[PDB]
């Protein structure tokens, strides 16, 4: 499942880099590198322009431990519950994932960041694989925003 592997590598690297402040590639490295750079520009913009909403959403989720981190899967599924899929929703979910990741670092729950990245990746790849393939994967992601 290369689409899962590539997606996890991009999403995990972004969440962990956002949480730790320290920038840390396999197959399709050139595309994945542009996707991660696109994610830095667009995702940092999303978190800044919607910071107040994200703060309230984070407080509502009330994440105090690793057990509270097993509820986000149902939240991520809710993003696409109306049947609509687009890159804006996808990048917004990953940006909010990075926002949670920063929170998890602050409360010394850094070990939860990887299961969070695996859960975001699973929802995208498991429930939207057809759409992601039709949109040409992360090449299409990079092209859609064309920063």
């Amino acid at each position: 499942d290369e689409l899962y592997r590539q997606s996890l590598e991009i999403i995990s690297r972004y969440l962990r880099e956002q949480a730790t402040g320290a920038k840390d590639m396999g197959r399709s490295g050139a595309t994945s590198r542009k996707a991660l750079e696109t994610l830095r520009r667009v995702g940092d913009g999303v978190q800044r322009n919607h910071e107040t909403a994200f703060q309230g959403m984070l407080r509502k989720l009330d994440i105090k431990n690793e057990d509270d981190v097993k509820s986000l899967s149902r939240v991520m599924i809710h993003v696409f519950s109306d049947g609509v899929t687009n890159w804006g929703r996808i990048v917004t979910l990953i940006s909010f994932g990075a926002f949670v990741a920063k929170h998890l670092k602050t409360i010394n729950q850094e070990s939860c960041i990887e299961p969070l990245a695996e859960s975001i990746t699973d929802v995208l790849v498991r429930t939207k694989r057809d759409w992601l393939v039709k949109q040409r994967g992360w090449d299409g992601f990079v092209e859609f925003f064309h920063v």
Binding site: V75, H78, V79, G88, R89, V91, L93
Partner: peptide, 20 residues
């Protein structure tokens, strides 16, 4: 509530990049 609020924000982001 949270996933719906993310969907709304994401649609605004999508419109911003998609509009011709």
């Amino acid at each position: 509530q949270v996933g719906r609020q993310l969907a709304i924000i994401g649609d605004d982001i999508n419109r911003r990049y998609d509009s011709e």
